[PDB]
Design a protein around this ligand. Sequence first.
Ligand SMILES: CC(C)CCC[C@@H](C)[C@H]1CC[C@H]2[C@@H]3CC=C4C[C@@H](OC(=O)CCC(=O)O)CC[C@]4(C)[C@H]3CC[C@]12C
Ligand SMILES: CC(C)CCC[C@@H](C)[C@H]1CC[C@H]2[C@@H]3CC=C4C[C@@H](OC(=O)CCC(=O)O)CC[C@]4(C)[C@H]3CC[C@]12C
Ligand SMILES: CC(C)CCC[C@@H](C)[C@H]1CC[C@H]2[C@@H]3CC=C4C[C@@H](OC(=O)CCC(=O)O)CC[C@]4(C)[C@H]3CC[C@]12C
Length: 422
Amino acid sequence: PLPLTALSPRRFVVLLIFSLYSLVNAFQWIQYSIISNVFEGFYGVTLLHIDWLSMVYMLAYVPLIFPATWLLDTRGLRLTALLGSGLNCLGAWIKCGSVQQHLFWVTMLGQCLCSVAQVFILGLPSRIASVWFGPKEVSTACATAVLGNQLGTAVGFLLPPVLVPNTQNDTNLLACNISTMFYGTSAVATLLFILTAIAFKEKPRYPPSQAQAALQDSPPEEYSYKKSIRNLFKNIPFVLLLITYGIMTGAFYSVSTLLNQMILTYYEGEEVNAGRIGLTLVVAGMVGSILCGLWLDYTKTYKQTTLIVYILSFIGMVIFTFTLDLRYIIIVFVTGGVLGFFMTGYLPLGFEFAVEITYPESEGTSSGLLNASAQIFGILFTLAQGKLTSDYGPKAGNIFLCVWMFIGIILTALIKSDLRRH
Ligand SMILES: CC(C)CCC[C@@H](C)[C@H]1CC[C@H]2[C@@H]3CC=C4C[C@@H](OC(=O)CCC(=O)O)CC[C@]4(C)[C@H]3CC[C@]12C
Ligand SMILES: CC(C)CCC[C@@H](C)[C@H]1CC[C@H]2[C@@H]3CC=C4C[C@@H](OC(=O)CCC(=O)O)CC[C@]4(C)[C@H]3CC[C@]12C
Ligand SMILES: CC(C)CCC[C@@H](C)[C@H]1CC[C@H]2[C@@H]3CC=C4C[C@@H](OC(=O)CCC(=O)O)CC[C@]4(C)[C@H]3CC[C@]12C
């Protein structure tokens, strides 16, 4: 109680503003893929181009996460938030000027800018929660921050199909709809960036928590990211957890990117239904994350719960694979909901397991490695599954995903640890 601790209303504002612009970023990640056929027709490109529009996020994250983490640690929260918001706004504005049949590269540049923004955006939740919220409010603030990005992904799934119908016959109408969507996104991003500039302060006048007061009082300490990574790789259980988490997240990313292709293969004129399926998957994933966190809290064992969740995710993936072609959209809805539930439920559990197993290694390095593995696996799975679907049909790529999930289960079982919640 020696230092003075107080809570300011501005924290909520900050938690809102980030949760908004981060949301927007997530939207921009999946806007193209969900209507990938429409953009393919408009730009006269192949589906691989639209897949790369989504994979640029993953590609940009891998080489910039560690530099971004260092910048956040050294310069503070405000600079990172401003960078993320401004980059997202600039990417949206560039996309606004990319609405033409011969200007795909402008949209690619805007998407790359949004990808660079994501690197700054993704790391802010926990740091903001610690800096601006008290001990009891930290968990809720972090949950809201992550839910912002998840809701952004869900909205990116749902909205573009409604906003941009597949009017390939009329180029003017398609261009007008794409321009409307881009201008709306740009306006929202600009407003959020202005709000971040005006109100997003570095930290409150007084620390919200005693732990935050101690952290701020402590002098800065330099950390060697390379040494931390080398020590982490020595931990074979952590390597196995990294591989499994990357496999699962990459499978989710590949399914999200190629969902439109799989749905359009068997159901025609169902882009809106595909977006609804994606939104159902994301919402079920949120619910599964909450329920799996509760299950882990009750049972208190990382290994058993993680393995069971992985097995359930594999079963759901197989069910979706072998039910997609039944030509019933409701079955696709249910299977996608179950699959997203289990897949997104796995992610927090695996992340916590990897963070705890790596102790006392810095959480930043482990988080960066986990996310980089997720991005790499997502890129590889997206490429392989897209090629398989184009050449042999969605079932081949889905079976490839199922095989990778089975390999992930095998790796998870091989993990040797008795770690328990403390
Ligand atoms: C600044 C950071 C975020 C990195 C940004 C990198 C991108 C500008 C690069 C990385 C991978 C590239 C893609 C890698 C492979 C392809 C497939 C390629 O396909 C063809 O040329 C097919 C031609 C045919 O149809 O015969 C077209 C370019 C494209 C989309 C590339 C476009 C430019 C990309 C997205
Ligand atoms: C498990 C599979 C699927 C993914 C494995 C990924 C790693 C092997 C790669 C991915 C990103 C890489 C990092 C990307 C950027 C940098 C910054 C780079 O900075 C420097 O050159 C200076 C470092 C210093 O200050 O000592 C050092 C290597 C490092 C940490 C890299 C180390 C190796 C990493 C973690
Ligand atoms: C850990 C990594 C290295 C695993 C890689 C596994 C791939 C080599 C497998 C996984 C899914 C397989 C595909 C699943 C389904 C099919 C459909 C299949 O269709 C056919 O024409 C033959 C069967 C039939 O008659 O229906 C042809 C092989 C193919 C593309 C398979 C080719 C081999 C794939 C890509």
